[PDB]
Amino acid sequence: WTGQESLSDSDPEMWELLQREKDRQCRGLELIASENFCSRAALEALGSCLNNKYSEGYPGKRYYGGAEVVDEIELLCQRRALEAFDLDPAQWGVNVQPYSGSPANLAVYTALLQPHDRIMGLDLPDGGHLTHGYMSDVKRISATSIFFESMPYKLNPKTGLIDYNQLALTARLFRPRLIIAGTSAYARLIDYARMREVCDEVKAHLLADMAHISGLVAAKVIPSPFKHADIVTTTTHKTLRGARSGLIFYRKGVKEIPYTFEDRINFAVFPSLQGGPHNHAIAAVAVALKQACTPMFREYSLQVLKNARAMADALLERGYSLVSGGTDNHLVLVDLRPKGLDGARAERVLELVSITANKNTCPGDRSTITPGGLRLGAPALTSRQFREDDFRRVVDFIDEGVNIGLEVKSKTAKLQDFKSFLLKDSETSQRLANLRQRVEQFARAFPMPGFDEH
Amino acid sequence: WTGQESLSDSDPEMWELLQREKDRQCRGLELIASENFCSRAALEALGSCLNNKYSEGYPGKRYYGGAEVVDEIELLCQRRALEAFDLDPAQWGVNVQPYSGSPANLAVYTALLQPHDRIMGLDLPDGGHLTHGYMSDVKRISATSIFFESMPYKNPKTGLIDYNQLALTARLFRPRLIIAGTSAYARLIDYARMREVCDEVKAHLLADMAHISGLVAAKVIPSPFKHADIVTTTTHKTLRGARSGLIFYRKGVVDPKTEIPYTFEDRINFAVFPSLQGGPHNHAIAAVAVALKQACTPMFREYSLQVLKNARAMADALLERGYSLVSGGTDNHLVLVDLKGDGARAERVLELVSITANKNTCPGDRSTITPGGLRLGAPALTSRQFREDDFRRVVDFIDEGVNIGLEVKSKTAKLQDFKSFLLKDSETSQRLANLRQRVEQFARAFPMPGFDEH
Amino acid sequence: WTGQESLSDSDPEMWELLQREKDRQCRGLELIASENFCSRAALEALGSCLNNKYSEGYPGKRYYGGAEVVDEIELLCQRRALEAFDLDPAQWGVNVQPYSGSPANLAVYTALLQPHDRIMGLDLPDGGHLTHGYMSDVKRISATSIFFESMPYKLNPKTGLIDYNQLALTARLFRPRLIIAGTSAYARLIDYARMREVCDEVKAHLLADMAHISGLVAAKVIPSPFKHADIVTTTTHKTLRGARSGLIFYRKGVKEIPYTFEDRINFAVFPSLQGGPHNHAIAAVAVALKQACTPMFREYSLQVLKNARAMADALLERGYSLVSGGTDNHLVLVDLRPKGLDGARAERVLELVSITANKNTCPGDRSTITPGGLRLGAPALTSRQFREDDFRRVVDFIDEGVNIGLEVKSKTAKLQDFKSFLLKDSETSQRLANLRQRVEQFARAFPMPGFDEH
Amino acid sequence: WTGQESLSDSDPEMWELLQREKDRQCRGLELIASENFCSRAALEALGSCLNNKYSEGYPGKRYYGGAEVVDEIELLCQRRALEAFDLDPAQWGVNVQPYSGSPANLAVYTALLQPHDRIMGLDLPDGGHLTHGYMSDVKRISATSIFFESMPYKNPKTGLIDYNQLALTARLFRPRLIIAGTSAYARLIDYARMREVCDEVKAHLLADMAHISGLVAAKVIPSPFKHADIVTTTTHKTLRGARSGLIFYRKGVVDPKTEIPYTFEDRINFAVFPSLQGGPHNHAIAAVAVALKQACTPMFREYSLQVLKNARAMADALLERGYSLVSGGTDNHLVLVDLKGDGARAERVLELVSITANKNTCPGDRSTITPGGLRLGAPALTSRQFREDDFRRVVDFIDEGVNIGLEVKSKTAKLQDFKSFLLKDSETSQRLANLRQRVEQFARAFPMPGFDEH
Ligand SMILES: Nc1nc2ccn(CCCCc3ccc(C(=O)N[C@@H](CCC(=O)N[C@@H](CCC(=O)O)C(=O)O)C(=O)O)c(F)c3)c2c(=O)[nH]1
Ligand SMILES: Nc1nc2ccn(CCCCc3ccc(C(=O)N[C@@H](CCC(=O)N[C@@H](CCC(=O)O)C(=O)O)C(=O)O)c(F)c3)c2c(=O)[nH]1
Ligand SMILES: Cc1ncc(COP(=O)(O)O)c(CNCC(=O)O)c1O
Ligand SMILES: Cc1ncc(COP(=O)(O)O)c(CNCC(=O)O)c1O
Ligand SMILES: Cc1ncc(COP(=O)(O)O)c(CNCC(=O)O)c1O
Ligand SMILES: Cc1ncc(COP(=O)(O)O)c(CNCC(=O)O)c1O
Fold first, then answer.
1. Across the interface, which of B11, B110, B277 has its CB nearest the CB of A103?
2. Which residues of D touch B116 (CB under 8 A)?
3. Which domains does chain C have, with CATH numbers?
């Protein structure tokens, strides 16, 4: 035994499963807005010997030894994190140690707020994330709502946009100490300036979760939340096209009233919440971050917008509804209830063809288990050199998939009856197999970032 | 740009900086009990395309689609984890989604305890970790102490802990979960004693197997999986996998008067998602499944069986030459010196000679800035096929470093001037480089798991 | 020494002070809405040997002895508490042990809600009480807002009434577990049915604080909050005209879904919060409670309404503003800003004449230390056999007092300058002395409940 | 109806039922260490017209008007309280507004501690009270344990507490305030030991003088007012006043390196109002001011000096006839029997003979439903001018009751049949009424403080 053996030789069972996923990604139309395809250069850094380095602490302020050059990669990851978002190293710091996006948000709360302090974020069915404080009417399900007292703000159901007026009214009576300005399912750009004015009135910190749109912010193709918010969090595996980690950006220097964000946030990530940093992920983020400073990444993010706008205008002419009218970023929200189908049936219909999407509730729904919409993303296929005409054909396969699920809903009743009919009825099982072949052949022709084997 | 370019061509920086890490892992003898050198097969799954998949949920119940492959990779890792520790699938279940060891422990707290409820663990300055409930008496450091009221447990004479002063403070603090785990402790823990002492106070037994994880899977050191109810661990230490976490929870059933099932697996799986974290790191789940398959092989048990006799030979070689073991022996994998002359003084002279360790507070130390004890680790170099006479030489290499350090401790002034004249004086850098030379020549000759370049 | 000596003989210093207060109450026009004049029969029961009886527990469920006949007075106090409000002894229980109104509300919260649970009450400047959860924009000042998370609902500034629509909107997003339906400064009757509909939608307990209006509810001259709310609290020293204590009324029996209010509320008062019950106060409340069942008390409460309505219509013809238009209960809220004077100056002007009132903020004020209104009560003087024509003359003295403070504000600037000018300037000091004599001579002619000496 | 009618004419019920209470207080010998017979002068101020005044606020800063008299009555009570315990007004302040002893203690917790912060007091089954932080290990009883995490302190051999096991659990629980008070304990508390043990753990010393309040004012028992920082007490026990509470807090200043004032009096006065309670009970504040004026007289010290030698004669008379004192003596005012034969069995046979006591858990009792110890009290009958030979007779009266109880304990079946055959069997009611007869004839002959009728 030496540990240098091959995965294909040491574990052919796992190498087979790990090889069956790559072809599914090659043959599938990934429309999930949160998913991308990480480059090869960042993946071989994520699966490297940096997994074998304990660097608890921070560069210079390490508690153990052996972090000679590991400190240099964390400083490199910090220096290009600010460079990718055009930040002064004297006015903005960055913490690269968050394991993912969810631990990144929890670190901001523990650093700035006391337990049971008041949190305001967009409600989950309206487009907010779990970590922005979410509670059902039955019990608290997000830990942000267990350790802190959260209260959500809703959309304007007429326009589908965030009700900034209702947020101003609600914050004046709830008196939050931190308001989250970030989205998981929202086609337009958040008015971060209006957010800042509401925060300054009730004396609250403005946290901007840049997770879905950070790649567009890095390319400067959409307004940057750094110009109004003073605490920015983001994942690095969505539009950033890197490994699964998290970044926390904070103001630094003087606000002389000093900005006291640098010391508490770094203390919340370690030693409060996390322990050993995933240095293999840090270097993978830094590889993707320097890719974000290149003119290629701006051309990539510019294409993600027009690709989402292309499918958005493509779905409209087919007779589809889009909440908030259309789209200004990377994801479109299709409203399926005007056509007689719901997101639950459509998500299962499109998945059996390898068009991976996700259900999403629409303003006005009262069903939970049967949402009337889907969230379709662009940056996944756009990294595969997809362009406008390619996304127009993606929607053509969507419609022919929706049209299938429409006639199946006429032959079936409950949702449990629906998923059993798509696999039993060979007349529909063959009709689904035809679009599957016609979708997988259209998808394999496009290049795929990363390794060609695994 | 396609995303398939090599790291050496795309980021010529990050390529060199990582090759300096693998060089350091080969140039030096790593002896931090928590560190290890993972196998090449597992890291290929760590740098996989599974980094791209969003699989929020669990096998069976998932909120997305296109998860056909990752579902079987997760169920494979759960079955490989249950087999690696010889657990009946009907009596035990495992969640394989925690990002690391620290998040795995916080998930068990959120699941079984309400906010500000009471836990008990051995103190960090007494051989514990931050995630067990450590507060600095002037500040609440870890989030284990901010969201849950923890009482630190600590006997300095026996070298062991005070396993009945814990029972003394048990009924007077009345905890709901006591932690039986170690971060810097050389002896075993009476797992039959920790259980009944939790039953008389109506508490839950939590075993944090993070350091002993390998010595338990190989059935060479007694296991907690029939005395404890919930078990958390790292896939990092002694298991030689990627950096992630595991939560071993009981499952199943007897109320003979007037049926009594376990209530664990629905709450801890809800704590991991959607409470604490979001999208699982499938590349980490697949990587640790490779290490778990290796853990069921006799090649891993003989590797484990070597670690104990390597640590025993490590302590005896130090015992035979004027060094006190803070236990009277060690069946674990680490040592505990009483450096009869301090702790923080040895690390600087070691890491400059390409040998890294960490400070350790010995029972009786009145300080924390200049402690008196080093914790050296066997699993790291044992994975490089180190054996008895190979480790006996390692204790002789530290000998010349500690013996030169005792000469610098006789000079200079406080800890600041210790590290000052080392990288400044001309004559002192002679024994620095000579001992580093022979240490590098002795280390590079051993095989190194993982890739050859990165 | 024997302890049977007279207060006039044992302590002539305290007997002098205690005698100077009674004449101030005899000579003064008490317009504070929360104040009344307790009868002699209830006062000599409040200052009796029942002070010398430890009866911790409840009748029958006593922990010590000696409560032979003390148990009978608590059952008598309970039986007439329900009788005074026309409650079925099988559908309503009552706890008479609360020391006062503030401990009564805190007992309801601790019995029904967990720490940091969500509370909704009327904001303090809008007419709510402290114990209904009040927080400034700077810090939490009420213990209800420290142990529980409170959020206030506001008035409709156009109509001066509670904004039930905004409360329905706010409760749907705040998700409270208890909503308070009670007032301290509100001239109209709360729509308790609308309150109940909002509580049943967000699944919250409806607590009605009957403190100011319980005498009107006992006489059945205003709608009873018992017909919609299931938890009712009240003081017994306002319109109840008894000692200073508190009552908690709760549903009992079946809601078979049982009502689980009786056991938890009785446990929160004792042993959770309070200790030894003030049995002298319990019997004093029972004396006043049986007075509330008499036809005299209904004629008294009927007069309190028309006396408040008389002064309300009297103030209107003098050119005064009343928020919410007028009055439907016992207290009128005068808005003084249309006349150029504020409640701070008027309260000090009327106090120096022995017309005791209190400042009160008005909808739209932004001054705190200079409120633009006053809260004038009726049940205090109405118990002195005051009638409509008498209250019309009370307002005549008010106007001539306001007219004084109007011309003083022209000769002065800051509020600290104002209170120093009313005592220095002998030209105004004599003008105030004239209305003082003309007010005290009008007040002494009316009878005064209680002892004629102390 | 005018409100000036006597209680005997208005409520002929309540008149008779109270005269049965004074009859019972005269017919029987009260020996509950907490009970007392208040003076006639204080109760005249308790049944005063000050019950009618709303004086929310403090002398100087009040939110109302017409408080000229009650302001001086409050400042008089503060000065009489500082003098009664010999405190410099510049070094000590007192708040006289707590409704009772339990609210006074909760106010000190809210003022100096944040929610869920940590306190330490002696356990209720070990001689404590609920307000010191008692939880039933299966439920959190007192609100001291619901809003603050309390650890109960407890040595059964010495009879005393374990005054260094408290130090054993001190640094391991790290409280912010330890309580030095007693509800059922016969010895004194080392006040110099409680202070330094709180200083090494950075805690506050709270002395709850509720039972020893009289023995401290008379300067016959050592005082905590130069070792402790905050002191709470009842005006009820040994002080022979109305039922209320007092909060003695330090005030004033020394930072010789690089001025250091006390930070107590602004927070505890804010905790009493407007945090916890609202309107003060001015009739109680005036009543206790009368008892405080009596406490500064030599007639009260010789009364106090009698209580100790009465309790010492009470214990020695019991010691001389086969009874064990749970201390080895008593300098307090209470006893502690080991009833060598139970506790709950004696109270029923006593209160039926017109002598009342209470259960007391002796160190070593495995039960709580049938404890083994009675706590008899001296201050009650000492106030009736009881002396040595008078109390020596009281121990001889209980003798025949306990000796008949040992015969019933030899019969019947469990505690249920003990009290069953007492009020049912014909022959058993003979020694019942005979011993009650001579006990009533012996009790009615002594003078009784307070009024003659009520
Ligand atoms: N934007 C957004 N997308 C996505 C996609 C994946 N993620 C991350 C993973 C999230 C997983 C998840 C989601 C929901 C619940 C949940 O608990 N759901 C409620 C009903 C919700 C609802 O929508 N209720 C009403 C609303 C009011 C109305 O309009 O009536 C309805 O629409 O019916 C319930 O099942 O109890 C849950 F437990 C776990 C997100 C995200 O965080 N954010
Ligand atoms: N109804 C009502 N009457 C009465 C009368 C007596 N009691 C019981 C005793 C209460 C004592 C008390 C009252 C207020 C504060 C307080 O803290 N007050 C704020 C500013 C308040 C305000 O009104 N702020 C704004 C409102 C928003 C706007 O309209 O702008 C303004 O009006 O300016 C501050 O001083 O900080 C306090 F500490 C203590 C009550 C009661 O509870 N209820
Ligand atoms: C705002 C936001 N924050 C965090 C996350 C996820 O954090 P992790 O990287 O820890 O999973 C998401 C993705 N949420 C799922 C989706 O949008 O599809 C998100 O939209
Ligand atoms: C006993 C124990 N448990 C859990 C963890 C958490 O592991 P992560 O850092 O991967 O979250 C650690 C960290 N171990 C630090 C050390 O001994 O060097 C640990 O020592
Ligand atoms: C609704 C309410 N609750 C409680 C209280 C007072 O509780 P205490 O009896 O414990 O003080 C008041 C009187 N608040 C003052 C006023 O209205 O003038 C009140 O209006
Ligand atoms: C030591 C102590 N402190 C405070 C209190 C509270 O007093 P109130 O019940 O007046 O709030 C008590 C009650 N004493 C009960 C007894 O010993 O009989 C007590 O014993």
1. B277
2. 116, 149
3. 49-292 (3.40.640.10), 295-444 (3.90.1150.10)
